[PDB]
Amino acid sequence: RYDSLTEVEVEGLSYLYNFADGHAYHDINEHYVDIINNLQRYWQEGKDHSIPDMEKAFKNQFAELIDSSTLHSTNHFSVCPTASNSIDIVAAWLHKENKRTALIEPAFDNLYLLLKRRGVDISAFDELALKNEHQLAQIVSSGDIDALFLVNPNNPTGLEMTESEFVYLVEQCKAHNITILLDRTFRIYGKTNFDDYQILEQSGIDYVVIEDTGKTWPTQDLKISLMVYSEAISSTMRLLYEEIFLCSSNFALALLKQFVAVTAKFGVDATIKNEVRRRSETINDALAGTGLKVFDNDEKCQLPLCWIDISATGYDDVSFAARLKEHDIAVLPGRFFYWNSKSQHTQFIRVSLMKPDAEFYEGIGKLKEAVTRILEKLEHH
Amino acid sequence: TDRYDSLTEVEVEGLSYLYNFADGHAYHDINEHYVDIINNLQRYWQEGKDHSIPDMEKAFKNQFAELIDSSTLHSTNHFSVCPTASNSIDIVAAWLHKENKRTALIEPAFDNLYLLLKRRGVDISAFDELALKNEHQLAQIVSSGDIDALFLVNPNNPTGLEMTESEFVYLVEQCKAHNITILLDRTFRIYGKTNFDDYQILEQSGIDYVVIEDTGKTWPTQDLKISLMVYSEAISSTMRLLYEEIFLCSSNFALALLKQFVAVTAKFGVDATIKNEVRRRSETINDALAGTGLKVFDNDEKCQLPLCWIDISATGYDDVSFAARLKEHDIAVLPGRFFYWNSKSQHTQFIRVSLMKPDAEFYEGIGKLKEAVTRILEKLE
Ligand SMILES: CC1=C(O)/C(=C\N=C(/CCCNC(=N)N)C(=O)O)C(COP(=O)(O)O)=CN1
Numbered sequence: 001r002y003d004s005l006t007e008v009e010v011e012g013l014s015y016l017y018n019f020a021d022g023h024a025y026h027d028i029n030e031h032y033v034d035i036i037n038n039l040q041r042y043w044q045e046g047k048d049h050s051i052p053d054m055e056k057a058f059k060n061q062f063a064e065l066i067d068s069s070t071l072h073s074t075n076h077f078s079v080c081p082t083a084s085n086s087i088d089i090v091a092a093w094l095h096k097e098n099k100r101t102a103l104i105e106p107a108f109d110n111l112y113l114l115l116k117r118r119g120v121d122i123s124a125f126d127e128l129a130l131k132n133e134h135q136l137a138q139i140v141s142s143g144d145i146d147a148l149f150l151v152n153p154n155n156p157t158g159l160e161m162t163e164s165e166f167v168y169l170v171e172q173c174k175a176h177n178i179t180i181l182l183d184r185t186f187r188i189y190g191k192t193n194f195d196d197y198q199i200l201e202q203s204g205i206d207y208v209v210i211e212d213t214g215k216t217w218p219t220q221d222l223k224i225s226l227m228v229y230s231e232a233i234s235s236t237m238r239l240l241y242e243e244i245f246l247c248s249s250n251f252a253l254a255l256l257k258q259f260v261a262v263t264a265k266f267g268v269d270a271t272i273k274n275e276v277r278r279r280s281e282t283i284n285d286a287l288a289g290t291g292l293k294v295f296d297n298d299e300k301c302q303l304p305l306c307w308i309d310i311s312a313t314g315y316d317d318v319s320f321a322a323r324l325k326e327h328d329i330a331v332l333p334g335r336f337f338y339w340n341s342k343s344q345h346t347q348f349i350r351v352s353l354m355k356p357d358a359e360f361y362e363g364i365g366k367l368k369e370a371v372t373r374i375l376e377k378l379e380h381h
Numbered sequence: 382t383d384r385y386d387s388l389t390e391v392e393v394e395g396l397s398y399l400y401n402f403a404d405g406h407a408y409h410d411i412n413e414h415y416v417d418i419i420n421n422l423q424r425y426w427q428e429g430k431d432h433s434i435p436d437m438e439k440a441f442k443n444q445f446a447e448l449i450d451s452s453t454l455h456s457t458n459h460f461s462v463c464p465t466a467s468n469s470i471d472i473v474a475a476w477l478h479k480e481n482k483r484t485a486l487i488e489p490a491f492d493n494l495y496l497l498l499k500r501r502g503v504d505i506s507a508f509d510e511l512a513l514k515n516e517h518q519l520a521q522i523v524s525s526g527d528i529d530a531l532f533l534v535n536p537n538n539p540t541g542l543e544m545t546e547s548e549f550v551y552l553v554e555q556c557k558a559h560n561i562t563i564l565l566d567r568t569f570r571i572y573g574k575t576n577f578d579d580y581q582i583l584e585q586s587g588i589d590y591v592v593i594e595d596t597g598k599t600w601p602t603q604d605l606k607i608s609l610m611v612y613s614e615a616i617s618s619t620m621r622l623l624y625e626e627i628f629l630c631s632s633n634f635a636l637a638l639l640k641q642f643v644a645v646t647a648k649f650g651v652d653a654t655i656k657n658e659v660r661r662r663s664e665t666i667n668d669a670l671a672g673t674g675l676k677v678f679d680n681d682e683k684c685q686l687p688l689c690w691i692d693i694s695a696t697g698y699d700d701v702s703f704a705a706r707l708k709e710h711d712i713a714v715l716p717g718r719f720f721y722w723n724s725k726s727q728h729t730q731f732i733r734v735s736l737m738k739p740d741a742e743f744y745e746g747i748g749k750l751k752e753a754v755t756r757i758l759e760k761l762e
């Protein structure tokens with residue numbers, strides 16, 4: 001039995017065709033090439049500027065990309081080397097302030113593990129409550145919770161809140177003095193475009209927002225996670241941050257600031273979303289007619305991953321992933337995302353898209369052949 | 382608030398001052414031995430792409446084992462790789478709490494070691510750094526039955542206290558005899574004067590241990606760092622579980638870049654690449670403070686850390702007040718009381734001045750520091 005999704009992902013790192021973890025590792029495209037050709041420029045940029053100036057410069061470049069004037073305005077933020085570090089500091093804050101916390105389900109499981117490790121009193125809430133107004137109202141009205149930890153858009157389902165859904169969420173939390181923790185790790189893949197920072201700040205609620213470069217720009221896990229919070233909790237949030245970190249890397253900030261700038265210059269679609277679409281189509285076309293059904297609906301966004309229903313095969317997720325491993329292919333069994341109800345959700349695997357290009361395409365062809373060979377060996381049984 | 386609550390808070394404030402001698406992160410200029418690395422950053426970007434994460438983890442660990450000439454470290458696969466040394470300490474603290482280990486922490490110590498253990502809920506007691514050099518005092522500590530784990534820093538920051546081989550062997554013998562777990566922070570290892578194989582001694586003894594390494598105080602890579610966390614076989618499963626709650630991995634680019642810095646240091650020697658410049662800077666600040674009434678902390682048993690620990694008793698000023706006066710002259714130093722994390726009020730007579738700052742800022746700032754010190758003292762008379 002696996003302890004966690006990360007245990008599976010670590011094992012996957014040793015496989016020929018690794019589709020387990022969702023960290024961005026695709027090849028540098030035509031537009032980002034110039035950045036690698038000029039690494040020395042960003043090394044020099046880091047040397048020539050103060051740590052506070054580089055922090056603000058990256059934050060503001062990101063605010064320009066997502067067109068949030070509210071984020072551009074605020075100085076209440078810190079810079080972590082990883083998004084999991086931002087999540088963990090938030091969990092330390094929730095425990096310190098004694099906030100009973102409802103955590104979205106499904107979720108990448110280390111969100112639950114970090115909250116649990118920090119001593120947070122955790123309960124589950126269905127991601128679909130973000131799209132059902134009175135299901136959400138009952139959750140926040142119960143007097144059972146003081147905070148709501150969500151992921152938007154959500155991993156692995158691509159569930160994404162509309163502007164009106166997000167406004168309703170903030171209004172309900174405001175009326176019940178509920179703190180919102182908002183994990184925006186997959187923001188750039190979303191289909192929506194509204195200023196969620198503006199809605200949060202104008203409401204007056206306490207909140208933390210977590211951003212991440214690591215699922216989006218392929219920088220070999222040299223990452224930046226912005227952790228942004230309301231004025232009223234900034235002193236304590238910053239104190240907890242400083243127990244761990246003095247700062248992140250000025251080199252990493254200068255480098256990632258340019259990745260963000262290039263994405264702004266050529267747009268999201270040409271630099272990120274079109275590639276995700278093409279790789280999505282590759283898997284869909286490969287699995288057509290096999291009985292494996294890619295999860296899809298009208299409302300979801302396209303994450304850098306595919307959520308696949310394998311129920312037609314008669315295997316559960318852990319079983320099927322074990323067979324694929326004998327063919328040098330590593331996938332993520334899906335049950336762990338349903339961290340409060342794993343055994344009711346054993347029919348899915350997750351396959352990540354943003355892998356090294358040659359490995360990815362060769363690997364999907366091997367995956368199609370392995371599925372074929374696995375199912376035909378099952379006809380002989 | 383009006384006062385300082387942590388060394389990191391003072392260091393953050395110091396980031397905005399013209400002459401910042403506060404934090405101890407390596408920020409000196411790239412010397413002639415390292416310039417070829419920066420001139421060819423693309424080579425290490427490419428190397429990170431060309432190797433799997435586990436194989437680059439091992440390649441860095443092995444290159445470091447070569448530099449420190451430890452066949453034991455070279456042999457072991459029980460280790461994880463963190464982006465910062467603070468992350469490694471935090472995971473160790475989480476392990477101490479999970480395993481219900483009453484922990485004696487060295488005093489003095491850089492204060493976030495104390496803060497992290499306290500934040501994780503560890504049951505903390507202080508022990509005098511001088512116990513490491515007095516056999517009877519250490520034996521009383523481990524045989525009391527009041528502790529289960531001993532957290533030490535060797536060589537110690539800010540005093541430069543360093544264990545001899547026979548002193549280290551005695552420590553391990555005594556902890557073994559009382560089943561005390563050793564947590565060994567070797568952040569400043571490369572500055573020590575000794576050369577023995579501590580990994581061999583720990584492995585041979587059979588005790589439970591974690592060793593923490595760091596590049597950040599030694600090689601100037603703009604806080605793009607690597608921290609090896611190496612541990613005994615018997616605790617490897619649980620240590621790796623806690624690591625994997627927070628990290629999948631660190632950066633392969635970071636590992637490739639830092640591996641070269643290590644390799645070059647091993648090729649040309651730690652004196653030519655590191656220690657010689659440290660000597661020049663220590664002599665520089667020693668000559669500047671001579672005859673001021675400020676007493677540089679010194680003895681014939683310490684090693685030379687990249688920092689200067691200074692008794693300001695003769696000023697009549699306490700450390701925070703004196704640091705406040707220097708700030709008025711655009712000079713940031715570290716008040717020493719927070720290093721005595723269990724007894725701050727009894728140790729207010731020291732400041733710490735870091736040495737490995739950008740070259741022109743350092744030598745110019747020592748001149749400004751001498752002038753500010755002279756002017757502040759003349760006004761008292
Ligand atoms: C919604 C969300 C995630 O899905 C997520 C991570 N997802 C992963 C790999 C996690 C690897 N394991 C770990 N970080 N302990 C995935 O494969 O989708 C993180 C943290 O990102 P970092 O791993 O710290 O860079 C934050 N929010």
Ligand SMILES: CC1=C(O)/C(=C\N=C(/CCCNC(=N)N)C(=O)O)C(COP(=O)(O)O)=CN1
Binds near residue numbers: 243244491493569
């Ligand atoms: C013995 C030791 C230290 O002295 C130390 C840090 N010393 C510092 C700056 C710490 C800045 N603040 C922080 N990490 N929250 C000094 O100025 O000496 C660390 C952690 O290293 P990192 O800061 O995480 O890179 C581990 N072991």
